[PDB]
Amino acid sequence: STPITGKVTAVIGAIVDVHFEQSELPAILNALEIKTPQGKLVLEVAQHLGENTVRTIAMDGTEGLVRGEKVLDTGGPISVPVGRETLGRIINVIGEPIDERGPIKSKLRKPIHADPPSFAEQSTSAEILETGIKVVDLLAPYARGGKIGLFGGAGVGKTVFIQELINNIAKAHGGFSVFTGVGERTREGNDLYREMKETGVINLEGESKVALVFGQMNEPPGARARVALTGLTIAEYFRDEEGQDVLLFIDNIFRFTQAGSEVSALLGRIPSAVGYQPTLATDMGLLQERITTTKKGSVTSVQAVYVPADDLTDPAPATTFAHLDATTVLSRGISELGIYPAVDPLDSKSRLLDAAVVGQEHYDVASKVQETLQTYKSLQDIIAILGMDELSEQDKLTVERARKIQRFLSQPFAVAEVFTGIPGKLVRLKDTVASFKAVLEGKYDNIPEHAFYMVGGIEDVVAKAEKLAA
Amino acid sequence: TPITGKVTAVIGAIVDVHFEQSELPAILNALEIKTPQGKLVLEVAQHLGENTVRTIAMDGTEGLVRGEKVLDTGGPISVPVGRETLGRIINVIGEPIDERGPIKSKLRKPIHADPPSFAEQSTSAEILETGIKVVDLLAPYARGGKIGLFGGAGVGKTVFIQELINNIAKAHGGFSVFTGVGERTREGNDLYREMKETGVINLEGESKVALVFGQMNEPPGARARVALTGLTIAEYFRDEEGQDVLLFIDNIFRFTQAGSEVSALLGRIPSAVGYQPTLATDMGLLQERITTTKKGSVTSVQAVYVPADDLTDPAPATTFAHLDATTVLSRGISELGIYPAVDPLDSKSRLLDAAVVGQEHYDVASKVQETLQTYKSLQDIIAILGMDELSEQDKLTVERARKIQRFLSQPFAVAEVFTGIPGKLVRLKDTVASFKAVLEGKYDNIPEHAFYMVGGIEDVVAKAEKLAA
Amino acid sequence: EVSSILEERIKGVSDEANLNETGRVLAVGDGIARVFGLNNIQAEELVEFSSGVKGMALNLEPGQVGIVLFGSDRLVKEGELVKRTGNIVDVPVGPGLLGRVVDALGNPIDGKGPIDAAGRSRAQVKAPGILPRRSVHEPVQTGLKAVDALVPIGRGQRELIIGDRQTGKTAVALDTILNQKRWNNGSDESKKLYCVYVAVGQKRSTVAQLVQTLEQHDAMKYSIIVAATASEAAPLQYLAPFTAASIGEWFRDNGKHALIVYDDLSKQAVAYRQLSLLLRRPPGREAYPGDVFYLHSRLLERAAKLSEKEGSGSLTALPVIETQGGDVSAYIPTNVISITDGQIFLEAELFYKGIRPAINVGLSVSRVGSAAQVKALKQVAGSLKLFLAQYREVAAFAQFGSDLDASTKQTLVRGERLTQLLKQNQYSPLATEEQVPLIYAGVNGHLDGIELSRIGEFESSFLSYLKSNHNELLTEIREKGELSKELLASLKSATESFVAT
Amino acid sequence: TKAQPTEVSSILEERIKGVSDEANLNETGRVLAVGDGIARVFGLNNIQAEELVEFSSGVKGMALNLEPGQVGIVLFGSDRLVKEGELVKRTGNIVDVPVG
Amino acid sequence: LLERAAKLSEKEGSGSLTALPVIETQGGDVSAYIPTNVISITDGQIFLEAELFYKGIRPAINVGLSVSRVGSAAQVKALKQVAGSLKLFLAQYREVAAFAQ
Amino acid sequence: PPPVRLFGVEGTYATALYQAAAKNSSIDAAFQSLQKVESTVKKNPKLGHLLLNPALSLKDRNSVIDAIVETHKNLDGYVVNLLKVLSENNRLGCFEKIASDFGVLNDAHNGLLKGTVTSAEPLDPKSFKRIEKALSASKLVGQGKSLKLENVVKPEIKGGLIVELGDKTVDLSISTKIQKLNKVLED
Amino acid sequence: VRYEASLRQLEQRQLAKSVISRVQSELGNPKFQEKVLQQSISEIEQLLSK
């Protein structure tokens, strides 16, 4: 209903309580505005405390707030703007441009809260998406209508991996995208914004094919949580009202988990296991189900995930591991060994791997590859203790193919012309299947291990062999 | 009227008063209930409002009638200090428990002091000799230094401090301090007697040692302000006089322990493990009231009691930052039979560098640290495989490390009884040599068992002849 | 006169006008209070105690407003009035804090010359946007060969130095400030560094040697030290990073460049623990309150690189975490790690192995990439990383008297010689022109002929020989920071010439 | 002295006005305060433990805690549309599912 | 409790109260909180091994963890003279029987 | 409705009491009567100092309540029912409390702005009239609100005086200045 | 030398107590009554100025 005036009673930090007029209250999830020195503070009603006093979360700083300061009721939820003018704007939690290219101008706006789509709509993935990187393609493909999850450790080149995807998958596959950054850092904001300017995907002459929602970790915990909602709501607008296909991207979604744990304690919620939120289960489930393919568009999320202190059975990574269709793990070790992709080729499971969906050849090759690496790792104890020359002829051949597969999993990346300097080359899904098969068969065990390093398909590997020879 | 009150509560040994007028009390003041059992001393530490203080109790609260009268002294707890204050034992309530009669009062000063300034600093830059080999080589003392001691107080940690008292205090410090929080009362009588025997305390007149012990009989709050009392005696020597100071402490972990005990009652919410939520600030105040000034340098030797031998707990841990040097003592080296029980890979000093103790001292010490650590890595392989199933270079290192390790034991004058081997001290200057020689293979001919319980470098050689015959 | 100065004090007490609020003190102790009254208060504001204590106010409640005392509680007493300044907490920033030690309020505590102020600044200053941000620019070196090659830092970037207490933690940081000498002296004010060092929970004797050491090397003509010792009040210890940040921001704002060292954030959390538990905020894991992350996260992002319309300004930050117990799976380490670009893990064992100050090269990463270092120095260290990884794997095989082969023992020897070369020295940083030769030498296998003991003997002599003849090569590496075809051939011939001894 | 969660200012002025209770608390309930999906009702005096309740919002609950000053309903659904001062009918049927 | 037990002087009549505080260990325990609290108060330990007692050696004392630091006269002279430096000797013996194989 | 929310716990009652009594326009009556029935509990020196704090059941206390309203019939119907509410929850120690708050609420309605003008020593009566005049003239009391001056003697105020009312204060004491000075002495 | 510099500080504390002393004197006399009157009339003057 119509505006109300409440006067603040306690500022403790992010939680700020208001004491509205009797017999007349704003509802749960409404938006209250308090005019503040630096923007307009929007308060999300998240509890009622009884006696006509609410308890709300700030989304802008809690510096210099008077307790007794008039609080207008807009009369509703937090509503950001959605549209085709969302493309190229840099949007933030309270829903306004911070790049000053003008507000998103549309007849339609939407609330940040929404209910996950109904069962009748739901659609499953069955097509196999092509990434254009050899490790991803053979041993863990993507599924278009996927909720891929980029779990990874420290020093893996997190930004690097995801930046490669945008170079390849994004231009090739139609539809718009929304790139949403949850608790990002100012190094990463500039580097991501710069990389998409190079590729002509951000047009400051045109409209962009991507939209951005950059909320940084220098904003209150409250805000960091609900930035995620703003970016998802735009993807919903693309999928439904325009009908568009979305290759959604979120970064880093451990940051959502961490943020959520913070406002939990403050709101009165008692601490649960390993210092994370109790309401873990339910916030993630609501977030994830919204991300799906319907009877309109098709949304394929690729979500960065950070595995604290390289343990992924810790309650934030491990819960998320289930909710994400197509997991990968990037690991400290493989980066150091000199191989970029940093992705572990062994721990990386998709929701579709079967032979009557990926294809019969694709399945039989990848069934071999997994076995070859798993043998070498098993053999490591024998090699380590007793000696390496006391292993059998079959074991040495398996070890030699395994080293070759490990260094024929090196692909260069265009966004690693910094990190490395060797420029990225795209290779097809089909081509990868074929290229990998030749190696197992033993027809290319004449090629040096290093003549498999950062090249394309088979053609480049044979040529590169000749090159080291010279 | 005088600020009188009534006893609203007696929750633990943390008594609560309620003043019957609205006249202003103040914090770090003292209040006295005249009880039929001696006197009772209380100290205001919080004001909770509605004319109700909450008080630390320095004396036993047993047998306490509630609604029984209090009076406000009007000011802080005041010790008596002096220069002839020496040769008596002082408790937190001012009195003697050694019964040598009234102390010389000249200046009586608050046990609560405002920490001196950063503009007055006379940092340690002159070395001191301890006369232990392990100590001199790896982590030598300094004058103004703050040394720490880790371990139990029954496994040889206490025996360690006795040696230190025997060497450092009979030939340095003109007026010297011993302060003991939760100090074992009969053992306290032993320290007093040994001090008398070596003629350091002569009656209750001029003496170059004073002592403060607050027994572990006393309830946790009383123990907490022992520490403070002792430091006030240390500061008079620091300020007025220019004469040499010392401090010996057994244990300031017991100050920390006492804080955890009081914490619940006062009105604080305990942080994890059990240690106070006010640990950094409370720790901070005593250790900035042990600090070098241009009014005099203050060499300190401190002891920390380690509960369950976990050093990873915040009370032992937060000390190191406030330290210059350590010589950590542990149960493991105690089992191995190495007395002193000091870890040789767990010692550190701020006097360790290649121009403070000079290049040669350093070079020797570095090599010793590499050798023992190499041996420590190879514990698995040696026991599970062998030493001939290990490379010839690492075997040399390993063979060397058993000799250097064994040599580190120094039978003491206060463990001479137990061992049956008369007490030893190995010089700083000798030490550099002793260890340097073994490193060059100049003494890797003679038994590991000859390196067990010897004094200097010549004795290692000489016992080799004793055991062989 | 003593009398003349007394006369002034007396004339400077008396008189004052209306008070926005009043309230009478009730609960108070530990240097934390709550007063009853006080209804024109807003967050972060300062209220003047009539004790003569100043305390800002951090918990607002419609009962008793919770004001954090900067003083003692022995002068606060139950019944007194407190009067609101009407002005939020601020620190003098100017050209006059440099060459001085200052406490967290920003006075000298060493009684050096006057604080010249050009302005006042605020504790919370919202961290830059992405529009005025710019790409990484200007290599910052510490003068430690492993740090520079492998985990190279840039100015406007964060990499976290983590590891167990007093394993050389202080020497790491002191080496960094010392290498900024080459630049401080050399022209261009946006190449000069004015470093701001922050000390939380540290004892005075340590700070007082430390400053002495900087004066000896003539680095205390730009060093500013912000201090809040362990004894001094818990709100000043929490407040200490955020006002140090502002002494840095002035440098970033003017276009000038600077480096801010935050040692340690971990004791800062304990001062804040005390504060938070007595204003009744409920804690999460290990009694650290859930808004701890929020503290470090806002802070570190105020050092970040700016654009050319703002003068190419960068404040750079180097946070320091001393782990109180060891383990980096602890709460405080997970929270700083997420915010920062790097780890520069230091190790206890490696201290004893003879690397002092000791750095582990494998639990340290830089996601900042290789172009935050000298261009010349990237090229030479190009396979330095790769060689080291290869060593680590082969060494693991080597244990247990395992049968070795000729292929592997090339690697193992190769790796052994490099580590001995690398080993740091206490309190001595080095200049990049003379780091570029040694790494080259190691990489092209001219150091893989030379015996382990004589790694050092070669290192000293090789550098020495170059000063006499090849002073042209050093000059070019300094001047162009990139390496020419012609310049490499000569450098390569120079190495081939000296190999024995 | 002690603080009840039934010390609510609308509720108190009604008792002061010489109005008695137990006419709008029979089965009949009114939400006092709703937070975290945990509406707390004053009323429900004929309710069965574990019995199903329907709010005015369109939301369903069950009543795990019956405490004298308030009833801690656990909401099955939305928190968004539920607010203070809404009627909560008593189904008169304990939590049940079709079987067949 | 413990400081109520202790030898006294002539004044109080020379009387003593001998106290052996007896701790219930789960196969030896002295690296946990409860034992360590008793150790810092006591003058020493009488550590006796589980394995040895059980395999019918009584007494069965490990003297790497058995110390007392006031015990310099607290034995009849007869049992000190004959038992001359045997306490050093069996603290060489464990070390000898480790590497004698 | 309440006009403003004042007081913490046991003010929820006082709030509620004013808003019930507000609908008739007789709070002044209610409150006066409450002073007179509260005082006759006090002039019950046994069981009216010895039954403020819980000591007997809800029911005996309730019957103590019934007996208090049968002996004093003027109390107003809001305050005869408020007592019932307090007795059933079984409290009487924070009985003076609701009473005190209810007075502040009432005197905001009367438009009195109660004030203490503490001094070091009792001032003259002329000094009083002049403070009342001046304080009206000063913009701290805009007018519309009728100031009262209450003299207090506090020898803890060492010299000077403090004028206090509402949220507006002028501290023109000597005592504070001495405290500030004593700290400042360095030379 | 130490003591000599200590004596410079000491004279300042000797005069510091004259200030404390002088307060007891001010408040011992009915200058305590007369200046309290002065404080009431300053407040009046101040009250016209706000």
Curated annotation (Swiss-Prot), chain A:
It comes from the Eukaryota. It is found in: Mitochondrion; Mitochondrion inner membrane. GO terms for biological process: proton motive force-driven ATP synthesis; proton motive force-driven mitochondrial ATP synthesis. It catalyses: ATP + H2O + 4 H(+)(in) = ADP + phosphate + 5 H(+)(out). SUPFAM superfamilies: C-terminal domain of alpha and beta subunits of F1 ATP synthase, N-terminal domain of alpha and beta subunits of F1 ATP synthase, P-loop containing nucleoside triphosphate hydrolases. Gene3D superfamilies: 2.40.10.170, Bovine Mitochondrial F1-atpase, Atp Synthase Beta Chain, Chain D, domain 3, P-loop containing nucleotide triphosphate hydrolases. Keywords: ATP synthesis, ATP-binding, CF(1), Hydrogen ion transport, Ion transport, Membrane, Mitochondrion, Mitochondrion inner membrane, Nucleotide-binding, Phosphoprotein, Transit peptide, Translocase, Transport. Its EC number is 7.1.2.2. It holds the Pfam family ATP-synt_ab_N. ATP binds at G152, G153, A154, G155, V156, G157, K158, T159. F-type ATPases have 2 components, CF(1) - the catalytic core - and CF(0) - the membrane proton channel. CF(1) has five subunits: alpha(3), beta(3), gamma(1), delta(1), epsilon(1). CF(0) has three main subunits: a, b and c. HAMAP family: ATP_synth_beta_bact. This is ATP synthase subunit beta, mitochondrial. It comes from Saccharomyces cerevisiae (strain ATCC 204508 / S288c).
Swiss-Prot record, chain D:
Mitochondrial membrane ATP synthase (F(1)F(0) ATP synthase or Complex V) produces ATP from ADP in the presence of a proton gradient across the membrane which is generated by electron transport complexes of the respiratory chain. F-type ATPases consist of two structural domains, F(1) - containing the extramembraneous catalytic core, and F(0) - containing the membrane proton channel, linked together by a central stalk and a peripheral stalk. During catalysis, ATP synthesis in the catalytic domain of F(1) is coupled via a rotary mechanism of the central stalk subunits to proton translocation. Signal peptide: none annotated. Present with 41500 molecules/cell in log phase SD medium. F-type ATPases have 2 components, CF(1) - the catalytic core - and CF(0) - the membrane proton channel. CF(1) has five subunits: alpha(3), beta(3), gamma(1), delta(1), epsilon(1). CF(0) has three main subunits: a, b and c. Belongs to the ATPase alpha/beta chains family. The modification Phosphoserine is found at S20. It comes from Saccharomyces cerevisiae (strain ATCC 204508 / S288c). This is ATP synthase subunit alpha, mitochondrial. The chain holds residues 38 to 137 of 545 of the full protein. It is found in: Mitochondrion inner membrane. It comes from the Eukaryota.
Curated annotation (Swiss-Prot), chain F:
GO terms for biological process: proton motive force-driven ATP synthesis; proton motive force-driven mitochondrial ATP synthesis. It is found in: Mitochondrion; Mitochondrion inner membrane. GO terms for cellular component: mitochondrial inner membrane; mitochondrion; proton-transporting ATP synthase complex. Its main location: mitochondrion. Keywords: ATP synthesis, Hydrogen ion transport, Ion transport, Membrane, Mitochondrion, Mitochondrion inner membrane, Transit peptide, Transport. PROSITE patterns: ATPASE_DELTA. InterPro entries: ATP_synth_OSCP/delta_N_sf, ATPase_OSCP/d_CS, ATPase_OSCP/dsu. One of its GO terms (molecular function) is proton-transporting ATP synthase activity, rotational mechanism. Transmembrane segments: none annotated. Pfam families: OSCP. Present with 32400 molecules/cell in log phase SD medium. Mitochondrial membrane ATP synthase (F(1)F(0) ATP synthase or Complex V) produces ATP from ADP in the presence of a proton gradient across the membrane which is generated by electron transport complexes of the respiratory chain. F-type ATPases consist of two structural domains, F(1) - containing the extramembraneous catalytic core and F(0) - containing the membrane proton channel, linked together by a central stalk and a peripheral stalk. During catalysis, ATP synthesis in the catalytic domain of F(1) is coupled via a rotary mechanism of the central stalk subunits to proton translocation. Belongs to the ATPase delta chain family. PANTHER family: ATP SYNTHASE DELTA CHAIN. The gene is ATP5.
Swiss-Prot record, chain G:
It is found in: Mitochondrion; Mitochondrion inner membrane. Signal peptide: none annotated. Mitochondrial membrane ATP synthase (F(1)F(0) ATP synthase or Complex V) produces ATP from ADP in the presence of a proton gradient across the membrane which is generated by electron transport complexes of the respiratory chain. F-type ATPases consist of two structural domains, F(1) - containing the extramembraneous catalytic core, and F(0) - containing the membrane proton channel, linked together by a central stalk and a peripheral stalk. During catalysis, ATP synthesis in the catalytic domain of F(1) is coupled via a rotary mechanism of the central stalk subunits to proton translocation. Present with 12900 molecules/cell in log phase SD medium. F-type ATPases have 2 components, CF(1) - the catalytic core - and CF(0) - the membrane proton channel. In yeast, the dimeric form of ATP synthase consists of 17 polypeptides: alpha, beta, gamma, delta, epsilon, 4 (B), 5 (OSCP), 6 (A), 8, 9 (C), d, E (Tim11), f, g, h, i/j and k. Belongs to the eukaryotic ATPase B chain family. This is ATP synthase subunit 4, mitochondrial. It comes from Saccharomyces cerevisiae (strain ATCC 204508 / S288c) (Baker's yeast). The gene is ATP4. The chain holds residues 193 to 242 of 244 of the full protein.
